[PDB]
């Protein structure tokens, strides 16, 4: 009989790190835009790495943060391609989880020889009512303690909500 300790999805994060720049990245930005229904953001590199073939302030990745119902919907699709399995290590100690998909057309998108097959990266910021405290301007705070989502608590939310297994190893 808890009032608002209702573990919800605060946001869903999606990022395609092509690590190229130019055209490949502009191509991958269309994929997220088709998926999420909003323009994404290009992130640039921190610093040059001659190994990976990247340069400082060169656009490496594209990403986006989905919120609300659309984030619930896209999360659902992403678990369907993963078949509602995660692991213990897929959850972070902070009570967030995430998982890859190897190819976006699995979610439900049409391939093109140009706009190819960008594998991508789901990550779910779980939260509660009254987490905003941390990130507002004026009278800020820290979210107590018996209110912070545990790893265990986030696993059981997944185990209930999306009927998942959380396989061991």
């Amino acid at each position: 009989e808890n009032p608002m300790r209702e573990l919800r999805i605060r946001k869903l994060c999606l990022n395609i790190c092509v690590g190229e720049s130019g055209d490949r990245l502009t191509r991958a930005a269309k994929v997220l835009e088709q998926l999420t229904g909003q323009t994404p953001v290009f992130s640039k590199a921190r610093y040059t790495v001659r190994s990976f073939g990247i340069r400082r302030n060169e656009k490496i990745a594209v990403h986006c943060t989905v919120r609300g119902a659309k984030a619930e919907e896209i999360l659902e699709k992403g678990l369907k391609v993963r078949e509602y399995e995660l692991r213990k290590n897929n959850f972070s100690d902070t009570g967030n989880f995430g998982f890859g998909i190897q190819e976006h057309i699995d979610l439900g998108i049409k391939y093109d020889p140009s706009i190819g097959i960008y594998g991508l990266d789901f990550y779910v910021v779980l939260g509660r009512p009254g987490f905003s405290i941390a990130d507002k301007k004026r009278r800020t705070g820290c979210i107590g303690a018996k209110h912070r989502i545990s790893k265990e608590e986030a696993m059981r939310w997944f185990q209930q909500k999306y009927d998942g297994i959380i396989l061991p190893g």
């Binding site: 301007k137 004026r138 009278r139 800020t140 705070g141």
Partner: protein, 292 residues
């Protein structure tokens, strides 16, 4: 495991930030520029029209700063407004206007400049400001303390500021962030501004919801539907309130007495209680372990 970031050491070397900086209240960078006088002005005050919008309220205070703790010459709250006419939407831009206006009038009534400096009456919305009359006591002048509010176009603080300006305080300002001013053109309507001052932005939303879906309107404007505040009633309501403020701004409080004087709180546990309490935990551990 990792290196403990917050050691003895960490706390020994640690410096707190000021109390109100911790509480997330006082921008001391801005406070210094706002509040201190030029030393050659000496003890002449430096007033500021503080305006803060709470989740359910708008406060308007005039204050100068002394060393004991900035003194408040006058105040007006949005929750007073029921007296004057405003039943609902007390955090809205129109309410902000009333609340500011009321502060000016109440302030002016103290100094006897109620008859001099009527200020703007008809509410155009355009650039207005008070010229001090010669052979008469000059116009009161303070400055707007926005606080931590993101000072954008249409911010409710500037709703209050507009009010106190029309009320007859000379507070300097531009019209670059009254609601009306256009970013991609750079002119000011001052009929858009009037609408906002009169609550027509709210009335139209009320009319838009009722047209589309009854239930959402019923949900959105529940206290507006109770008290029977309708879209077509709205403009009149705020104009009545403006007049009533303008005719009597004086605050009378309530004669508070008949207090039982009882402790809701929990007082501080005395040394000796604390001293025994460990004594009992020490015993209780010993007697407990001498069994299994």
């Amino acid at each position: 495991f990792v290196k403990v970031v917050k050691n003895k050491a960490y706390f020994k070397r640690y410096q707190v930030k000021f109390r109100r900086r911790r509480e997330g209240k006082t921008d001391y960078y801005a406070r210094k520029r706002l509040v201190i006088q030029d030393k050659n002005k000496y003890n002449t005050p430096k007033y500021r029209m503080i305006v803060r919008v709470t989740n359910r309220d708008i406060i308007c205070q005039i204050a100068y700063a002394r060393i004991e703790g900035d003194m408040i010459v006058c105040a007006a709250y949005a929750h007073e407004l029921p007296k004057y006419g405003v039943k609902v939407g007390l955090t809205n831009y129109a309410a902000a206007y009333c609340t500011g206006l009321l502060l000016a009038r109440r302030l002016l009534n103290r100094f006897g400049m109620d008859k001099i400096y009527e200020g703007q009456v008809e509410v155009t919305g355009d650039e207005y400001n008070v010229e001090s009359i010669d052979g008469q006591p000059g116009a009161f002048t303070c400055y707007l303390d926005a606080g931590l509010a993101r000072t954008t176009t249409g911010n409710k603080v500037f709703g209050a500021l507009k009010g106190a300006v029309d009320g007859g305080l000379s507070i300097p300002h531009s019209t670059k962030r009254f609601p009306g001013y256009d970013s991609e053109s750079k002119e000011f309507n001052a009929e858009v501004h009037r609408k906002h001052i009169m609550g027509q932005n709210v009335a139209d939303y009320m009319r838009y919801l009722m047209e589309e879906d009854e239930d959402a309107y019923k949900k959105q404007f529940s206290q507006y539907i109770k008290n029977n505040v309708t879209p077509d009633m709205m403009e009149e309501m705020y104009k009545k309130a403006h007049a009533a403020i303008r005719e009597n701004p004086v605050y009378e409080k309530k004669p508070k007495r008949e207090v039982k004087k009882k402790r809701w709180n929990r007082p501080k546990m005395s040394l000796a209680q604390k001293k025994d309490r460990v004594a009992q935990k020490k015993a209780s551990f010993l007697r407990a372990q001498e069994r299994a």
